[PDB]
Structure formats: C-alpha cells, structure tokens
Design a binder for this molecule. Structure first.
Ligand SMILES: [Zn+2]
Lengths: 139, 1078, 98
C-alpha cells in the first residue's frame, strides 16, 4: 500500500433481458476530438520563476535587461503561436502591435531582491564582503 | 454482469465487488473520477498523470496535493535514548508459567543516564512519506547541523553555525516539525491480553511480522514490579485501568469499529497537531448529492448529472472552501503572469480550439463568392480573400472576453488604411468597411473612437471637425487613439459636429452613439459549492461585450432586432449615403454608383448566421466552459461609451492598509493598455462574422449533450480546489513566519525573541521565504507553483489585494479577508511549546560563564549553584561594550582593558562580554586572555541568549580537565560561525565511589538540565552525582488519579502518554451518471 | 564594487567597520566614530522587481569631487525631456502630416 512520491525531498444468474454492447449510436460532436481539445486546454500554467532566488540566495534567470526581456518573450510567444497554427507567419501577433508599449517591464534575473544589479552573484558578494575582515594567527 | 446502481457493465464477480465500493457498497483505487452516460456505451475514467502504461484512460494534468495520508505506527515524536549504559545485579530475572520463562521487558532503557531526544516519526508506518524530518542525534553527538542549513552557504568553518541566524533556523525547524506530523491516525486491529498486570484489556497491534515487541514500549503499566528500582516503583505508582482501548464507535463495519480511543505512548504536541489537522480536513467535507447539484447546475440545463450512493458516515471528500481562498489563488496567478506573453499564449490558443471543437458554427467563405458572382465586387472579393481558411483570430477574439483584466485584444495596425486613407479610393472604402465590421468584437476600450477617427482621417479635405488644441490635427492616425485621455471632445459631445459642414461624419458619429453594441452579463457555475474567484464582479456573473438572448434555431436571418445584424445594416447604409451623390469621389470618370449600391446591398442582405450564433449560443458555451478552466476568468467591467469609467490600470499590493512604505508598483501597471496587448486580423474577423452557418439538421439538445459529456469527464475542478486550499494556507503561514525575523506591521504574539537574530533585509527575507516555500512543496508533493510570484522583491509582506482605477481617478480596491490557517496555528503552538521545552531540541537559554573551577564536587554544570554565577546586580562586576581596547603594561605593570564607563581595569575579577566582542576580536582576545583564564583569576560571562550544546561525560573517580575542550572552542570561534558549547558532566552511580579532582571551565548560568529523563534507572537509588527520578509530571493521566482522561497541560510540559483517537475512512472517487434531457 | 579584486575595498570604503581591539592610533580613531553611518540608508524603489532609481550611501569619498559631480548631474538634469514632450515637438514640427 506504500504510495510512491512524485518529487524528491530530503534524500441461476441467467442473462437478464437488458444488457448488450452493440454500439448503435455515434456522437456528432466527436468524443475523441472533444477529449483531445480538453486535454490541450486542461494543462496548468507555465511557472514564471526568473527573478526569484534559489536556496543559496542567488536569483534565477538570464542577466538581460527588463524591457528587452519583455520584447523577447513577446516575439517568442508570436513564434509559438505561428507554430501552433501551423503556418509561416502568426495571424494573432503579440509583438509589433499598434500600441506603443515602451514602458512595459518583464521580470528578469538582472535585478536582485534589494534593488541592485547582480553582475556578481549574491553568494560571491557575501563571501568577499565577509572575507575582507578575517584574521590569522600571529605566529 | 452489471451494476444496478449506475448501470455499468462488468465481467467478473470480483470486478463487481470492487466496483460497488465506488458507490459505497461493501463485499467480501486507481481511478480519480468515473463517469458514464445513459444514451450510449462509453464510460470515461480518469487516472493520475504520473502513472505508467495507462490502458485508454484520460489523465488528470493538475497538480493536486496529497491531503489525506495515513499513519499506523505510534503517535509519538519524542524518543528516549540511553547515554551511559550499565548492567546491575537483579533479584528477579524472569517469570514462570508451569514450565515457561518470560523475560522481563522494561518500557525504558536500563542505563545509568538516559535523556529525551527528538526523532520525528521514529516509530510509525506510513503510506506516503512527506519527507521533512527533524532527526536529532543524542546530545553526546554533535547536532550543529540542525542550525546551519538555511543562511550558511559561505562559512569560515564546517562545524560552526552563525549566531545571527539562530531564530531563522529554529523557525524553519519548527515549520518542518509541524509539517512532518500532518498525517492521519489509522485503525489497525487489537488483541486481548491476560497477563496478570494487564488483564482483559484490548491492546493495539502494529502492522508487520512482529507485534509483541511493541507491547513493552506502548504500555508501561504492563511490566509488573518484580524488582526494587526506579522503573519498578514508578510502575507501582501508576494506576492500572488506563490501558489499551478506551471506547469505540457504535457504527461497526463487519465486526470492526469505525474509530476508537486508546491509551498508549504518544505526546500531547503531536496529538494536538494531528487533531487540528483532522478538524481542518473534516471542515472541508462534501456530499455526493451536492456534487450532483453542482455539476447539473454548471451544465446550464442541457444535461442532468446524478450520483447515487449508500448511507455512510465515514466517507471523506474534502472539497469545500471559501471564496477568500479562491480569490487569493487568483491574485497569485495574476502576479505569476507578470507581463510574460508566453504564459498567456497557450491559454488563449487552447480555449480557442476548444470553442472551435464544441461549437455548432461552421465558417465557409464560399457564401460570399456565391452572393457576389474597377468592378467593386471583384475588389472586395480580392480584399476579403475568401480562399484563405484560417479563422483563429475570430475564436481568439471570443476567448479573450474572459480575460479582460490581463490581456486586451486590439485590431492589428496593418488593417488600417495605408497612409491614413482617402474617401476618393475604392480600396480605402473597402478597408473601412472591413475595419468597422470587425471593431465591435474586440475588448479594447477605445474601439468606438478608433472606428470614428478612421473615417475622420479619411474625410480630410472634404469635411472638418473642431480641434482641441494647436498640436494635433484631424489627420492623426486612428490607431494612435489607445487611451481614454485621447477621445475628442467633438466625438464625446455629439452636437459639436455641425451637420451643414460634416454631414456624413456626424451621421457616422450618431450611428456609433446609438447602435454600438450594449454590454450584458450572464451567470455561470455553481457559487454554492464551487465558490467563485471573481474579484471585481459579483460571485456568479460573466460579463460580455454584447447582448445575449435565449436560444432558438427558428429565428429569421434578417432580424434587425439583433445588435450585430443592425450594426452591419447601419454601416452599409452609411457607406451607401457616402457613395450616393459622388460628392466625395471626383476623378471617377465612369459612374460606379449602381455597382457600389448593388454590392453594399448584397453585403447587407447576406444570409450569415454568425450574428445569431454570437447572440444566442456563444454565451451559453462560455458559461459551460468557464467553471472548468484551470485559470478562471479575470474580468474588468465593460463600459460602452462612458469615458470616466474606462479602466486604465491594474495593480497588486502586498503591504497592509495602515502603513506607508516604498511605493512598489506591480509590473502589471506598466502596460499602456489595461492588459498585455495582442493584435487581431480585422479581415479574418469580418469574413468569419459575415459567412457562417449551422448544420442542416442541428438538434440543440443532442448537440450540446454530446459536446458536454466528454469534457466534463476530464474535469479537474476538485484538484484545483484542493490546490487553492494549499495556496491560501501557504500564503498565511509565510506571512506569519516572515513577520518573526524582521520588522513588519503584522503582529502575531512574538513567542520567541530570546533566540538572537538580525533584522533581515529584503534579500535575507526572500531567501528565507524560499526555504519555507520549498519545504512546503516537498511536504505536500507539489512541483508546479506555490508562492513563487511573492518572492520577487521584498517578500516582507502583510496581505494581498488587487485594485484597478477608472479614468477619473476613482479606484476600486479588493481585499480578501483571509481566514485562519491550520499550519500557521500549529506552528505558533509548537513555538509556544518550544518556549518551555527548548532543552529537548538541543538548545539552552541564557549564557555561559568561562572560569576555572577545581574541586571534588559533583553538581552537573548544566545546573549551577548560586555561588559561581554573577550578573549586573553583582557588585564588583565590569560590563564591557564594543569599545574595548587593550593596552600592554610597561616595565612590570599589568595590561588593561577598556571598561564601558571609560576606566581601565587589569585582567582580574568578573567580566561580562557580549558574544559579539569575542566573535569580532577572536584571534587577538584569545592570545591576550588564554593564560589568565587558564591559571589566573579571570572569569568571563559571555552572554548569548541561545546556544547549542554538546555533552562530554566522564568518570567522577579519576582526574579530568576541561581545558583541552574549552581552548578548542575558544580557538574555533570565528566572526561568522560558532561551534556547539562543550560541557563536561560527571556520571551518576547507584553505589558510593571515591572522589578525584576535576578542573572544568565552562558552566551555564541557569537550569538547562531538562532533557535528562532518569539516572540509574535499574537501581534502587542514586548515591553520587545528578539524581533524577522518573518525571511523573509527564505521566499525568496515569499517576494523577483525579485527572480527566483528556487533560493536557500542553504549553508548559508535554505529556508522553495520552489518549489517541484512531480512524478508518474511505475516500471514494467522483462518480456521476450523465443523463440526457429531451 | 565591480572588479577583479573586490576583497580589498570593503576595508578602504568603510573605516568604522573594523574592530578596535587596540590602543593604537587607528583604533583610537575608530572608537570615536558613530556606528549607524555605514552603507546605504535611503533608496527610491518606484517599481517592484526593478533597479532602485537612486541611493544614498556613506562611503569613503571626497567632498570636492562629490560637489563637482553634483553640479554636473544638476546641469544634465536641467536638460532632461520626456517622451510626451518629444512627441508634441515632433508632431508640431511635422504639422500633422506625421
Ligand atoms: Zn456501479
């Protein structure tokens, strides 16, 4: 009865006159197609985690600017839309719309939680700031 | 075979016996949901998505936690370990039954010294390991690894912990302690007993091969009093009739009860935690009748669901929650979106395909060609291009109605006329027709003004309108009107456009004001049992940007009562009036009035059915699909033309209402529109809205029954409800826990502050919250997402809330009233108990006094007498601060340290450091003070508050010297960590012994000898050393005669023998029998 | 600081951060300074999950160069223009044709 885990942690009956299985009816909406569409639409949402820290305290994600991050995510969504529609150019674009949206920010791994850039990760900053004041034995 | 309850066909008798269990019938587990229709033979089961080799079974792609998990072992979480073993001669060695010898089994270790430790779930069978264990070795080992796991990545030592993170580490340890006992006691069977000491008492039997090895640990009374010792006279003191089973339920199951109350080894803390968890789960109980009602109501009346069952009380279906938790989950998901179009794209695309697959509407562009047959007809044919067959834009425009507040859909930039356009151009006229037909279906709030200003731009040089300022002009591009602050005064106040100067333009403006579609609202889902995650709308409402009417297929095509048909007719009439007199088209050498009129008449009188569809059957499909979505609809109100109510910004808030902090606007406020913008194809929307039809033999009942059955058979609403429970609980616990290690306006009782720490900044609090998040995910077996959006910048929050604003400055603020949270309640309880039982988790309060003490006395340095201790009241004491500066002597003088008052003092007497002084100047103070501490007359009281300790027992009949340990500790202290304080305790003996000297240097300053359980447990009495009989205060219901069987003094002392209540439930799958409606 | 050898700057920037175990002159100086004037003490965090827009930090500096750079920043801040002003200027220059 032991249930596994999904992740890792710290380690005279005669046949009565009603029954039959002859399959007379077929649904017009299409049970297989409806189940396929439901499978596609049932999926949970993507986990947008970049900007948040890991165990050691270092933020996750690339070191690119916020606005260029938003632009790249937009046109990647456009490419994925085209791929889903199975064409060469997406017809429902998320990028290069008519709206001027030059102030939009999208969370990236460039900025830490304090509000400073991490060109030198948090663990490295802590380590050097602590090593700056250690001392040895006299002799 | 067949089941006469749900009318399903089986094949084996064991199959029937296993099948009736899902309804509640007994006999003599892989499925999540099991449905069956009544008009056909096609069951649909649903199994978890991680299992292998599924044989034609749908999946459950959700991420449901593991709420219900059972435990069959003991309920205790505190074990007793012997430290210094010892054999002793005895008088009685075994029992006798005519020929038999039964060995004497004692409930406690027969050792010279035995003390309590903390091994969570040391004796427990489990069906699902939550895997968050607080495992503690005995004190003679080193337990420093329990306090150096959270904020110790850099570290100047491997076996040292940072004393500025003790409180954070202890809080995480207590969180894991609570989060590990979230199990559910089980009802393993019993067995009588006829031992002369436990006679006729049903005893519980653990599962497994052996069962009588645990009868000595579970029941301390069973052992008689053969010998004369501490265990013996304790058992003599204890009373008898509290043993085994207390009472049992009246509802049996075969010959086995439902629940049972039993006396046995346990602790009040874990029994209380599990009782509160049980109450929390029972509060969520649901009913198959209510599930029946909920599904039959969500189906909008096309299908009636029924789910039968038998009378049972031990059924547990935890699925009921409050609207506050749904709203908090919705806020978390809205924060997750975070301006990342990649997390919006799949949702809209998949909802689009689902609508396309369950809708009766068919879109063939051949209708336009058949009705048609510079040749304006051929011009519009080439401009609509009916041969193209991609209508994803139409379905996505429909699916975007549910997500007004996060994503806003606008017509493409490329659809507008080239270079602004001119009314003297047939191509631009047809561009305007397509654009005007397509505009009313988008969620852009400036759609009417874009529609007006398109024709206004085209009318330059022929008609004029009043301007607002000296900067802009009538030939400003219609696509640049993307905000409410741009709407022209002439468009708002309609009488400014003079009919003698701008006749066609005033006609178009009046048509926009009068005949633009009117918003409405339909009600969906079951707000009685599924709650509702609507934030800015009432609990059961689905806003729509168009009117909706009851359905029927026998309604005339040309019906100008319909809003969209009326809009098409009005637009065609205005373009006709524009083309009539040729007043606006010089340069046309031939007269095209007849051709233009004929084509516009055909366009107006086309036999499309998309308006009928959008009016009648689209809203019902949206309402049938809404309550089943993973990310439920997030809407902001639709204002038709009232400009002062146009929503323009949506933000999220973390801090409380009565406080002023950094203005930290959410990322969702940076969008120029209200949500992320996505463009659409006006040509595709117009073609789909202009050419559509039904199948010739549509019977709506049959169609929607067959289309609703297979998509409710794969519903994950219940998993989503459980996950919303866990999300709200995690939010509350994170707030309650991060408020302890920082400065925040969320005051909860501050149970432990004697444990030192620092005022954590944003980064430290964020990493701490990350550890908390990861621990909860690991405990509940989640992998997708929980609290991640909250960790993006300053997690020191107080409460969530979401609010938008109108154009005129008014703002609407929603604040879900978060209810109580069982995990946070249990964590606060365990901290309140930690306040008194800190010793058992390997911690001591107060501070240590470092000073040479040589004598032949046996007084257990964890329990110092009053003579050796000094404090501020003590006269002749010197208190030192950060400005402590040493100056060497000269020519025979003595060195001197800088007092706090300012004077200098030699290296003598009693001092009082903070720990920070030593932790700063370790390498210097050590070389300066070593000899004076060792052989001088120097004594220091380093004050720490909390510190982990480590015991070193020795023989009190031989020489001992603690300097080699004391100096090691003092050497190993470092500016970032500190090793566990080494003590030197003597060994107690039941016989008299010689006495030898002992030189020990470190002693505590208050009683820390609380984990000591008993010394010389198998002897009659202790004669030398620390004496400690068995603590009768913890065995209260046994020793104390006039005590109710459930009494617990839990905050002060935790009991080790309680009344546990064991359960045995059944958790059937979601059953339904989908019937059709005539 | 961004650089190869950053360990050598936490002691140059922050004089009052070391310990004073000695009667030497440097320790006599450090034992007189106040304790709260180190590192950052003010910031303007307009946006969540973005760079702080400015900070006030105590650190080893030079009043002359601080005044010079303050003057330079004031001069540059007097020249600042925003997208709305640029939009109005370009529209009025184009005379409606753009
Ligand atoms: Zn059945």
């Amino acid at each position: 009865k032991r249930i596994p885990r999904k992740t890792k942690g710290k380690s005279p009956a005669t046949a009565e006159p009603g029954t039959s299985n002859c399959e007379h009816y077929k649904a017009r909406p299409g049970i297989a197609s409806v189940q396929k569409a439901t499978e596609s639409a049932e999926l949970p949402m993507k986990n947008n985690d970049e900007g948040t820290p890991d165990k050691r305290g270092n933020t996750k994600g690339a070191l690119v600017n916020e606005h260029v991050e938003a632009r790249d995510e937009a046109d990647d969504a456009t490419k994925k839309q085209a791929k889903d529609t199975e064409k060469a150019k997406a017809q429902v674009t998320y990028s290069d719309t008519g709206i001027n949206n030059a102030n939009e920010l999208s969370r990236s791994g460039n900025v830490d939680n304090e509000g400073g850039s991490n060109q030198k990760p948090m663990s490295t900053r802590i380590a050097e700031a602590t090593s700056a004041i250690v001392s040895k034995h006299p002799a | 075979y067949q089941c006469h309850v749900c009318s399903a066909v089986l094949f084996s008798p064991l199959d029937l016996d296993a099948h009736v269990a899902s309804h509640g019938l007994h006999g003599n587990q892989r499925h999540i949901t099991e449905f069956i229709s009544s008009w056909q033979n096609h069951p649909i089961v649903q199994v978890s998505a991680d299992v292998e080799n599924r044989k034609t079974a749908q999946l459950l792609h959700a991420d449901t936690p593991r709420l219900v998990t059972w435990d069959a072992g003991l309920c205790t979480s505190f074990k007793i370990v012997p430290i210094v073993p010892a054999q002793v001669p005895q008088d009685v060695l075994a029992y006798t039954f005519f020929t038999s010898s039964y060995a004497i089994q004692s409930p406690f270790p027969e050792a010279a010294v035995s003390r309590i430790v903390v091994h969570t779930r040391w004796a427990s069978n489990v069906d699902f390991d939550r895997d968050s264990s607080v495992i503690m070795a005995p004190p003679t080992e080193n337990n420093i690894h329990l306090f150096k796991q959270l904020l110790n990545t850099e570290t100047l030592s491997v076996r040292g912990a940072n004393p500025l993170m003790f409180r954070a580490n202890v809080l995480h340890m207590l969180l894991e302690f609570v989060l590990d006992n979230l199990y559910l006691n089980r009802h393993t069977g019993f067995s009588q007993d006829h031992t002369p000491f436990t006679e006729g008492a049903n005893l519980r039997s653990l599962p497994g091969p052996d069962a009588e090895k645990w009868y000595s640990i579970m029941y301390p009374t069973r052992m008689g009093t053969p010998n004369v010792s501490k265990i013996c006279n304790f058992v003599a003191s204890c009373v008898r009739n509290r043993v085994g089973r207390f009472d049992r339920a009246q509802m049996m199951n075969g010959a086995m009860s439902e629940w049972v109350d039993v006396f046995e080894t346990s602790d009040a803390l874990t029994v209380s935690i599990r009782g509160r968890w049980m109450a929390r789960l029972a509060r969520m109980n649901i009913n198959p009748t209510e599930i029946e009602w909920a599904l039959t109501e969500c189906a909008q009346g096309y299908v009636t669901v029924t789910s039968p069952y038998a009378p049972s009380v031990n059924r547990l279906m935890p699925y009921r929650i409050s609207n506050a938790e749904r709203q908090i989950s919705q806020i978390i998901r809205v924060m997750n979106i975070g301006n990342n179009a990649t997390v919006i794209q799949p949702v809209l695309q998949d909802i689009s395909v689902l609508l396309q697959r369950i809708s009766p509407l068919q879109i063939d562009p051949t209708i336009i060609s058949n009705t048609m047959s510079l040749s304006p007809a051929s011009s519009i044919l080439g401009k609509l291009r009916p041969s193209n067959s991609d209508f994803s834009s139409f379905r996505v425009a429909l699916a975007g109605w549910l997500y007004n507040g996060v994503v806003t859909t606008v017509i493409d930039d490329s659809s507008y006329p080239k270079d602004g356009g001119s009314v003297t151009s047939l191509e631009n006229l047809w561009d305007f027709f397509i654009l005007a037909l397509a505009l009313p279906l988008t969620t852009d709030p400036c759609a009417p003004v874009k529609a007006f200003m398109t024709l206004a731009n085209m009318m330059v040089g022929f008609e004029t309108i009043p301007m607002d300022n000296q900067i802009y002009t009538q030939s400003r591009r219609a696509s640049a009107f993307s905000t409410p602050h741009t709407w022209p005064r002439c468009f708002m106040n309609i009488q400014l456009i003079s009919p003698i100067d701008a006749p066609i333009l005033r006609q178009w403006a009046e048509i926009i004001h009068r005949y633009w579609p009117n918003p409405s609202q339909i009600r969906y889902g079951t707000p009685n049992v599924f709650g509702s995650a609507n934030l800015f709308t009432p609990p059961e409402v689905l806003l729509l940007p168009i009117d909706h009417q009851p359905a029927n297929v026998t309604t005339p095509t040309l019906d100008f009562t319909n809003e969209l048909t009326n809009w098409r007719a009005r637009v065609c009439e205005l373009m006709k009036n524009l083309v009539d007199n040729q007043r606006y088209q010089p340069g046309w050498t031939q007269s095209l009035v007849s051709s233009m009129r004929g084509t516009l008449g055909k366009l107006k009188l086309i036999k499309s059915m998309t308006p009928m569809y959008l009016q009648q059957l689209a809203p019902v499909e949206l309402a049938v699909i809404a309550p089943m979505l993973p990310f439920p609809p997030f809407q902001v109100p639709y204002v038709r033309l009232d400009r002062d109510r146009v929503p323009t910004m949506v933000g999220v808030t973390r801090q409380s209402r009565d406080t002023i902090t950094q203005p930290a606007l959410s990322l969702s406020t940076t969008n120029t529109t209200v949500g992320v913008p996505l463009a659409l194809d006006a040509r595709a929307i117009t073609v789909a809205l202009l050419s559509g039809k039904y199948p010739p033999d549509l019977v709506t009942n049959v169609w929607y029954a067959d289309a609703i059955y297979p998509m409710y058979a794969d519903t994950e609403v219940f998993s989503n409800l459980q996950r919303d429970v866990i999300t709200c609980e995690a939010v509350q616990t994170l707030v309650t826990l991060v408020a302890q290690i920082s400065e925040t306006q969320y005051p909860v009782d501050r149970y432990l502050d004697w444990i030192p720490s620092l005022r954590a900044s944003a980064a430290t609090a964020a990493t701490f919250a990350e550890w908390v998040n990861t621990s909860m995910k690991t405990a509940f077996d989640l992998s997708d997402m929980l609290l991640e959006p909250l960790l993006s910048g300053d997690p020191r929050m107080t409460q969530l809330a979401i609010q938008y604003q109108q154009y005129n400055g008014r703002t609407f603020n929603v604040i879900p009233e978060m209810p109580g949270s069982v995990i946070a309640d249990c964590v606060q309880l365990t901290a309140e108990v930690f306040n008194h039982e800190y010793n058992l988790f390997g911690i001591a309060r107060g501070d240590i006094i470092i000073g040479r003490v040589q004598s032949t006395h046996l007084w257990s340095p964890l329990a110092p007498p009053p003579d050796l201790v000094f404090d501020r009241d003590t006269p002749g004491v010197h208190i030192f601060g950060r400005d402590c500066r040493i100056s060497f002597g000269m020519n025979g003088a003595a060195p001197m340290i800088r007092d706090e008052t300012g004077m200098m003092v030699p290296f003598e007497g009693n001092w009082i450091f903070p720990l920070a002084l030593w932790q700063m100047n370790t390498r210097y103070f050590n070389q300066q003070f070593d000899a004076w501490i060792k052989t001088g007359e120097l004594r220091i009281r380093i004050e720490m508050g909390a510190y982990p300790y480590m015991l070193h027992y020795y023989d009190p009949r031989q020489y001992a010297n603690a300097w080699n340990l004391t100096s090691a500790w003092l050497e190993e202290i470092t500016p970032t960590s500190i090793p566990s304080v080494p003590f030197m305790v003597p060994i107690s003996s039941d016989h008299d012994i010689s006495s030898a000297p002992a030189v020990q240097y470190i002693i505590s300053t208050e009683y820390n000898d609380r984990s000591l359980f008993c010394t010389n447990s198998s002897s009659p009495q202790t004669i030398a050393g620390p004496d400690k009989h068995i603590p009768v205060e913890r065995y209260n219901i046994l020793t104390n005669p006039d005590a109710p069987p459930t009494q617990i003094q839990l905050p002060e002392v935790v009991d080790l023998y309680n009344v546990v209540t064991r359960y045995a439930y059944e958790t059937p799958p979601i059953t339904a029998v989908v019937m059709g409606v005539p």
